[PDB]
Amino acid sequence: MQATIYDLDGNTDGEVDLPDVFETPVRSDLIGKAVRAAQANRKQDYGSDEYAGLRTPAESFGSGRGQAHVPKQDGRARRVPQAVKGRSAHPPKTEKDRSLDLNDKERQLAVRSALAATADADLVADRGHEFDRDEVPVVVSDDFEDLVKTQEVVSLLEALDVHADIDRADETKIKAGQGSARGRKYRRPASILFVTSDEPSTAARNLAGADVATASEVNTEDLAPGGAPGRLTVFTESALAEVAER
Amino acid sequence: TSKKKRQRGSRTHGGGSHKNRRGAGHRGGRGDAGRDKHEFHNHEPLGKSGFKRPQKVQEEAATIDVREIDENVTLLAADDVAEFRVDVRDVVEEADDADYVKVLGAGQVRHELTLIADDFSEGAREKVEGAGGSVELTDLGEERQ
Amino acid sequence: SKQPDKQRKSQRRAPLHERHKQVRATLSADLREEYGQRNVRVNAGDTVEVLRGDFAGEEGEVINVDLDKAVIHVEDVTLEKTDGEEVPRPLDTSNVRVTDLDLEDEKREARLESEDDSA
Amino acid sequence: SKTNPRLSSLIADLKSAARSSGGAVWGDVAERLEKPRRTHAEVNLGRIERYAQEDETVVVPGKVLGSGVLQKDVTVAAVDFSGTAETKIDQVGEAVSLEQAIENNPEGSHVRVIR
RNA sequence: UAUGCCAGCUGGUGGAUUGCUCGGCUCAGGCGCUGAUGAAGGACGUGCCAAGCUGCGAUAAGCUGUGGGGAGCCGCACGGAGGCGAAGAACCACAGAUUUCCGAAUGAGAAUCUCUAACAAUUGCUUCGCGCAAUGAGGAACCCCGAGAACUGAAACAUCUCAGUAUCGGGAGGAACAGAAAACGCAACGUGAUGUCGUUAGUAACCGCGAGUGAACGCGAUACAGCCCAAACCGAAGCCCUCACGGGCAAUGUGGUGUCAGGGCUACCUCUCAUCAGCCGACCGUCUUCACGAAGUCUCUUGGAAUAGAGCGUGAUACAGGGUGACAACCCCGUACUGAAGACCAGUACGCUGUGCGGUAGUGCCAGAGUAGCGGGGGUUGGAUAUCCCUCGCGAAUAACGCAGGCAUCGACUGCGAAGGCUAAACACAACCUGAGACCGAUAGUGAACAAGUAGUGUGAACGAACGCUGCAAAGUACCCUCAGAAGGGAGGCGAAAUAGAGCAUGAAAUCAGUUGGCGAUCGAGCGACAGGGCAUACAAGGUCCCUUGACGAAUGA
RNA sequence: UGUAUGGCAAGUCUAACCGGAGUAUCCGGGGAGGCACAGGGAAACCGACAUGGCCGCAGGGCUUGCCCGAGGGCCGCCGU
Ligand SMILES: [Cl-]
Ligand SMILES: [Cl-]
Ligand SMILES: [Cl-]
Ligand SMILES: [Mg+2]
Ligand SMILES: [Mg+2]
Ligand SMILES: [Mg+2]
Ligand SMILES: [Mg+2]
Ligand SMILES: [Mg+2]
Ligand SMILES: [Mg+2]
Ligand SMILES: [Mg+2]
Ligand SMILES: [Mg+2]
Ligand SMILES: [Mg+2]
Ligand SMILES: [Mg+2]
Ligand SMILES: [Mg+2]
Ligand SMILES: [Mg+2]
Ligand code: NA
Ligand code: NA
Ligand code: NA
Ligand code: NA
Ligand code: NA
Ligand code: NA
Ligand code: NA
Ligand code: NA
Ligand code: NA
Ligand code: NA
Ligand code: NA
Ligand code: NA
Ligand code: NA
Ligand code: NA
Ligand code: NA
Ligand code: NA
Ligand code: NA
Ligand code: NA
Ligand SMILES: [Sr+2]
Ligand SMILES: [Sr+2]
Ligand SMILES: [Sr+2]
Ligand SMILES: [Sr+2]
Ligand SMILES: [Sr+2]
Ligand SMILES: [Sr+2]
Ligand SMILES: [Sr+2]
Ligand SMILES: [Sr+2]
Ligand SMILES: [Sr+2]
Ligand SMILES: [Sr+2]
Ligand SMILES: [Sr+2]
Ligand SMILES: [Sr+2]
Ligand SMILES: [Sr+2]
Ligand SMILES: [Sr+2]
Ligand SMILES: [Sr+2]
Ligand SMILES: [Sr+2]
């Protein structure tokens, strides 16, 4: 198909052919799989101390004193799982493999399907993104990579009726639960993904919910965050072309 | 919902009597214990059979059936198109770590081929020649005598 | 560190010379324009205006600056004990604004005006 | 529980065809697809060449692989085709998707099932 | 109705629950030796008032200098008194001063003291004099060299297995060890020091041929690095101490040459950029620390408090995280960007100085012995005839010789020179620094969030807990009454809240006091389920229910 | 060793590791090697049906019992 290119003022600046990969049939199940794997793969190993609860010469008195055969030390039960201060029976273990494998073909297929989901305006709107537009993804001239001020990228997104998505993401949720105590107090909607070619947009990166990426390595995650296909994206002309042979 | 997930409240978790799932007694010993007494059933019998020759004295031939070569003649355009001529040593995968290349005669040969290999089966020859083909033994392959 | 526990820890355990930054307050419009800074370490000479407590709206002279507890005493911002005595109600400098400075120290005035540094 | 969304759709369409139009093979193919993947067809070309015949669409309730040779000018219809399989078929005949088959031939007439 | 039963209510008791995290747990990166110049550890001291902790050492929570920092300060710890700081204190970095006694503990002895100059003891050098030096002991584990179980598995058990594991003895370093082929043996017209990672492979091999045990070559990677003697031939041409003088060593050989691309010697060709010794000496990168660093604290409402709701505005190469009277990019610290310092990389790379690479011909001059090898007896190994090692005995050749290629002998062939030596880098651990987390969240997580190896137990080896939360602010309750009263009580005061009042957020169950409803001193025990009655009930979150009569009317049925 | 789902398919998957980067995630490279693609035999060593016959389910066809009949079933035949 075709993709209308836009200059830094938001006016049309010609158009190019939207590469074949964007025709790839949406495969949300394969996408979700690729996302599930990547999320698991960055998880750190953990587990309780090998010897927690075992540091004691506690013994059981056996039969004779009218008490259960529970190991005791200084008149206090120890070691065994049912005992307070006792070892954890089947605790989290470090040795455990917490990574998920994935066939390159199966994963590469997911990237392509995720890429393609971007080109469907109904999907993109279904995923949740707020915008006033028919064509999607949003194609912009390579002169986007030269912008510097974040505010400049704002005026451009407003000129494209696509800034509303950033107002969607401009709200942090203070999570429920103890993650708060571990440094995960906040979270927020995932908004626009900006894909360039040479380097990630330092100008766009700080926009609420925005994620920046390069065409050579834009993965399944930024394309379909949380495994949900159809992220409102903006490609730089060169990126759009480079992303074709992924 | 899995089987494991449904075990809470079952007490026995499917092991029958709570007197069952104890130590190795419930298994009749550890590992292959009793392989010739209480558990001899379905076990290769006790004993020694045959001998082995030293590995560096063992030859490993890389085989290929004519059916394989023949089904891929037009595809193998990168190989001689005489009045079809093919050096099998170039077709077979893993033909370097093998002591030699031998052509076996399974299948048909719907073409006239001129095969070059270190060895051929009696059926490999019959089939190739019977289709107006010829078989050429490599210099190395000149061991047959 | 991005971890809350370590963050709070570094603040509650910062050595004296580092605690100065815990008693910094924002400068007024004129002061921001004059010295080219947004805030400054509140001194016992400075005048200040309360912007948040039950004392919001009040103006007063800074009487004390405790680094150990990172809190300040402002003139007339007090509490009445039961015996009738009037005791100071410590204020966090982030709930306050500097309206006047004590520049009797040549070192502080120099630091405030220099473009390379900040007080 | 088929997890692939498109396999799910195909089956719903195979059914609709078997129910609405006269097709009785589509509903038959649908039933085999609903079964475990191990029971699905993995057919090589050598087997289509041996049993298929011209002007009689070959329906494969699975996937077609590229082993062997195909000379017959036949229209092979399968859930999916291997890269080599589809290339070899198009050389002498026509490799078509099961979804195309249903749209063109909803009555499922003149069709030989191959596995 | 008393004793009393059930449920509830008000108040306790208790400390669950929910929320909170100064602690843990695990992963990752960085870094990494200390001690006779007396360590680590311990003892006892040290403050105005000082018990514990921390610090420090008779100069005792400290003294000096340089830099940073800055109007405050006098640790944990918010008292009282008092003091210090613009003579620039506190505080931080670096360097230095001081640094009691016991402690390897070293003059001798000793439960931290004592008796009358001391490297005790063992060594090397030596002016033969403790004159100059070394060792000792510590460290989280990692590493190297020795000694070496058993429970257990085999459904018994002996070989075997557990396992060269546990534990013990000795020892080094920041890493260890290994290492430039008498190799390999995809047998080749091939590879080319060594570790390590992936694989080869649960393959070969072992084994009451049971259970079980279990490599290597090669390959793909990581990192790469190659050298020095002994001897031949020279023969004092040399080395060590000392400022020098002078002394010491050394013909039983210091020093030159040389080291399988064998070398030496003789004769020539040519040449060196190899090597070895030595000088200089980083970039970058990584870890950590630091400087700088944008934008609202505007309106209304609620509130004790605005970071809330509604309205308006701003920054962003900064929308990580924390603080702040409730949810904060714009209030404070920070964060992006840029920059600076230290450390590690590394006395390395590069560069340079010196030296000389190499080749031909001749020459039986040289080339490591209880060795190679054989036998007896053992251990060890996958090592089977064919692992490695110990012990007793025997025991060779000399490059024209010798060893290896998985049984021995002989020939051939291919490979390689043992019985001398050194060697960077890539790898192990986690003491120490920093970072991280689908880990735990105070009976959890460490034994230890608190006085934690604390209190406490045992002669001793050793054993070993529990205890987190007032409030926004101490505003931590003045005055009065009562009392034996700094008690407690009453009244009162503060605060949004004292049922927030001190082990003070919330405040469950068991259970207790008082009390409400139902039952109750003539009556029978799994405490109830299902039916139906009495009595009882503020709202809310349920709104139905009774009677005449009429309609419909299954099986059944007068 | 089964099974369910998914990718690819006469092939399939990379391991250590390398580069990149948004730096434990992720993108690219890496096929060493494993399993599958022929078996039988202690070994030496030899080396197979891209279909020849008959039934016949599903499904298709026809002029509505008669044809074609993958899979499956019974035989042949082939390698050792
Ligand atoms: Cl064999
Ligand atoms: Cl097939
Ligand atoms: Cl080799
Ligand atoms: Mg525990
Ligand atoms: Mg919860
Ligand atoms: Mg200034
Ligand atoms: Mg002594
Ligand atoms: Mg046993
Ligand atoms: Mg037995
Ligand atoms: Mg063993
Ligand atoms: Mg070997
Ligand atoms: Mg020399
Ligand atoms: Mg043994
Ligand atoms: Mg605990
Ligand atoms: Mg309470
Ligand atoms: Na313990
Ligand atoms: Na793991
Ligand atoms: Na049981
Ligand atoms: Na009584
Ligand atoms: Na270190
Ligand atoms: Na000494
Ligand atoms: Na004290
Ligand atoms: Na000291
Ligand atoms: Na002496
Ligand atoms: Na047993
Ligand atoms: Na026994
Ligand atoms: Na044995
Ligand atoms: Na090879
Ligand atoms: Na504030
Ligand atoms: Na011996
Ligand atoms: Na050899
Ligand atoms: Na607790
Ligand atoms: Na391969
Ligand atoms: Sr007894
Ligand atoms: Sr069972
Ligand atoms: Sr047991
Ligand atoms: Sr038997
Ligand atoms: Sr290969
Ligand atoms: Sr302090
Ligand atoms: Sr304090
Ligand atoms: Sr090398
Ligand atoms: Sr030698
Ligand atoms: Sr408790
Ligand atoms: Sr006792
Ligand atoms: Sr009162
Ligand atoms: Sr009775
Ligand atoms: Sr009736
Ligand atoms: Sr692959
Ligand atoms: Sr058949």
PDB file of C-alpha atoms (C1' of nucleotides) and ligand atoms in Angstrom, chain E residues 36-38 106 119-121 133-136, ligand 21:
ATOM      1  C1'   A E  36      58.328  -8.086  63.920  1.00  0.00           C
ATOM      2  C1'   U E  37      57.936  -0.317  61.200  1.00  0.00           C
ATOM      3  C1'   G E  38      54.310  -5.805  66.133  1.00  0.00           C
ATOM      4  C1'   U E 106      60.064 -12.431  70.271  1.00  0.00           C
ATOM      5  C1'   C E 119      65.005  -9.947  66.776  1.00  0.00           C
ATOM      6  C1'   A E 120      63.015 -15.704  71.836  1.00  0.00           C
ATOM      7  C1'   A E 121      63.420 -19.652  68.316  1.00  0.00           C
ATOM      8  C1'   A E 133      68.261  -9.547  56.693  1.00  0.00           C
ATOM      9  C1'   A E 134      64.381 -13.695  56.521  1.00  0.00           C
ATOM     10  C1'   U E 135      60.428 -16.812  58.932  1.00  0.00           C
ATOM     11  C1'   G E 136      56.284 -16.940  62.633  1.00  0.00           C
TER      12        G E 136
HETATM   13 NA    NA G  21      62.324 -10.372  62.436  1.00  0.00          NA
END
